[PDB]
């Protein structure tokens, strides 16, 4: 598993308004599990509160394709042309609503203009035309 | 050395009041060199601008004892009782002035109450009896408009 | 000519403490003149005041070597190994003092870590071991109370 380890969630976009937008994010850890599954852990600062999220990504028979939220969501993990970056694209149900999302992951926290421009091209091609939000980063989350 | 690698500068105090009042700091990198020397690199955000500092720490014959600034300053690298923390203590010339400083380093950015309480005792004992500054942390420093 | 046009002064270092350190800078314009000379125009914000500088760089017979400040300074202009960046290194008199400086120029205002790391190697090799200041960028400069 190459996608294993420490990642920075640097940018996100979607097909719908996301009012669930964080104020800061901790690094994302993807832990490789039995049977090719991935456990994603991240902490988000939303409304003064540090919310710790854990999402298990269930491996399918298609490489790079995962399910989550008990099948209500399909997540595609694709490499960026730009080094040290990966793109998540997801479809299906989140919090009752049905939303398509893209997330830009990087090994490094440093902003990459090149990775962002590529993330824009990818996203707008998939018909995600909302704003691209580049997320504030913090190694820890403080109320 | 054990001290090699990535550190968070989590707290600092001094004998004077330092004009170096950062708004955030990047991690401190101590890079091992030929002959047991250390290159200390850190970046500080001050008023929209990034101060990229590099200090070569010249190994002496005394473990934990280093010089810097052409012998004009002495730096003691001392382990904390508390796990994954170190204390830097320094005496001599910095930017022309005489100043003594203590800095608390940790492998993790999470503040440790135990490490901080010990760093307070260390500081008060050494006559670095000003306020202890806990620094804002950022993995990067970017100037305004860059 | 290669150096002509719009630059961002992104980083600066020196061999002496520069107390006259800028808080913000406008872009540097290098205009090519008759006979291979260069007119450098920049505005710097220093303690609420705008320094509108025009420096004529007088071409010599040595490629990349210029004099300026009515002969009080010699300026070496080299490309950076890193793309879309240039390095100025200068020796001589500034504000009634002897001081050696390096300046990192870029076509883009966005930080390049590669250009900065290279600028450090270049500077430390010329014995400029002070902090590398990465400058805040502004299209305009306005004095306090204007």
Swiss-Prot record, chain A:
Glycans are attached at residue 52. One of its GO terms (molecular function) is small molecule binding. This is Major allergen Can f 1. One of its GO terms (cellular component) is extracellular space. Tongue epithelial tissue. Disulfide bonds join 50-141. It comes from Canis lupus familiaris (Dog). The chain holds residues 29 to 171 of 174 of the full protein. Belongs to the calycin superfamily. Lipocalin family. Coiled coil: none annotated. Keywords: Allergen, Disulfide bond, Glycoprotein, Secreted, Signal, Transport. It is found in: Secreted.
From Swiss-Prot, chains B, C:
The keyword Repeat does not apply. GO terms for molecular function: small molecule binding. Keywords: Allergen, Disulfide bond, Glycoprotein, Secreted, Signal, Transport. One of its GO terms (cellular component) is extracellular space. Tongue epithelial tissue. It is found in: Secreted. It comes from the Eukaryota. This is Major allergen Can f 1. The chain holds residues 29 to 174 of 174 of the full protein.
């Amino acid at each position: 598993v190459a996608v294993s380890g420490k990642w920075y969630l640097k940018a996100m976009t979607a097909d719908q308004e996301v009012p669930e937008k964080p104020d800061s994010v901790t690094p994302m850890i993807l832990k490789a599990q039995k049977g090719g599954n991935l456990e994603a852990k991240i902490t988000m600062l939303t409304n003064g509160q540090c919310q710790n999220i854990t999402v298990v990504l269930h491996k399918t028979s298609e490489p790079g394709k995962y399910t989550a939220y008990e099948g209500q969501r399909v997540v595609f993990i694709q490499p960026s042309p730009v080094r040290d970056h990966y793109i998540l694209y997801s479809e299906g149900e989140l919090h009752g609503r049905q939303i398509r999302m893209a997330k830009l992951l990087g090994r490094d926290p440093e902003q990459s203009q090149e990775a962002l421009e590529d993330f824009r091209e990818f996203s707008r091609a998939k018909g995600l035309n909302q704003e691209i939000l580049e997320l504030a980063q913090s190694e820890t989350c403080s109320p």
